Design a protein around this ligand. Structure first.
Ligand SMILES: Cc1cc2nc3c(=O)[nH]c(=O)nc-3n(C[C@H](O)[C@H](O)[C@H](O)COP(=O)(O)O)c2cc1C
Ligand SMILES: Cc1cc2nc3c(=O)[nH]c(=O)nc-3n(C[C@H](O)[C@H](O)[C@H](O)COP(=O)(O)O)c2cc1C
Ligand SMILES: [Cl-]
Lengths: 132, 131
């Protein structure tokens, strides 16, 4: 199944990046990503998604995503991300590596879900208890 | 719904209930039954580890075990066993479903049968994460 078509239909917040390009930049973003983050598309295309990060983002959470990308692994993390206006929100984030029939990573899709503080407390706790 | 999406897409997948002991299957798609050869009576109310066998990489299974311990999404390529003992390469994905309060309510696991060439490529990268 097209996971992307599934996300389009469900009108989710997601982006697709191209690892064949230096620094793995956004080459597609849904309307949902734009509404959520406040960015317009010319602000987002061709950029690494790390702009979503800021001073209050947990760097160990970011490392999980980094490893997942190095391994062509699917993963999820709850971390804090930044809107175009500098304000934060909690992101239940998911990333998938898409592979061809030959097994080679061809793209990444990242899905963003806004969650409450209460939600984040629970998930971040198990993340910190994982880190310790 | 991730589950409604998998239904529509006619995927091979299961949903388990971690609120019951040993986190048993409480739903299995038709795709899953076709793939593994299991019937619904043999698997409903059971834990998925029956898919594993002697030639499965115990390190891939461990990768799956941590995801459940942490309530994380993950994907692994490992060898699984059908109801008659034959093997197939499984590009597996597991997701934790959470309520609004952040509590894991379910696990969803999706199985995609892949070629020897595919498994070769991915499993090599899995093995390479030695140090
Ligand atoms: C498809 C895709 C989507 C991503 N989405 C997010 C995101 O929503 N929020 C975030 O903080 N990082 C996201 N990332 C991670 C960053 O782009 C980047 O990989 C992260 O900073 C790790 O790289 P670095 O340590 O070199 O900065 C995403 C990565 C990819 C490939
Ligand atoms: C929803 C779900 C689907 C699973 N699917 C598979 C699978 O397809 N193949 C597999 O080898 N293990 C699968 N597992 C993992 C086993 O069910 C079990 O969690 C794993 O063997 C580790 O648990 P254990 O330490 O008790 O053996 C799945 C687990 C869950 C929760
Ligand atoms: Cl998927």
């Amino acid at each position: 199944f097209s996971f992307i078509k599934a996300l389009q239909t469900a009108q989710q917040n997601f982006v697709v990046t191209d690892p064949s390009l230096p620094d793995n930049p956004i080459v597609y973003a849904s309307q949902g990503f734009l509404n959520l983050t406040g960015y317009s598309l010319d602000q987002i295309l061709g950029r690494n998604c790390r702009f979503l990060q800021g001073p209050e983002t947990d760097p160990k959470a970011v490392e999980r995503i980094r490893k997942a990308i190095e391994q062509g692994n699917d993963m999820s993390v709850c971390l804090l991300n930044y809107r175009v206006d500098g304000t934060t929100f909690w992101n239940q984030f998911f990333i998938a590596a898409l592979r061809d029939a030959g097994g080679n990573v061809t793209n990444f899709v990242g899905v963003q879900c806004k969650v409450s503080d209460q939600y984040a407390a629970t998930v971040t706790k198990q993340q910190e208890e994982e880190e310790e």
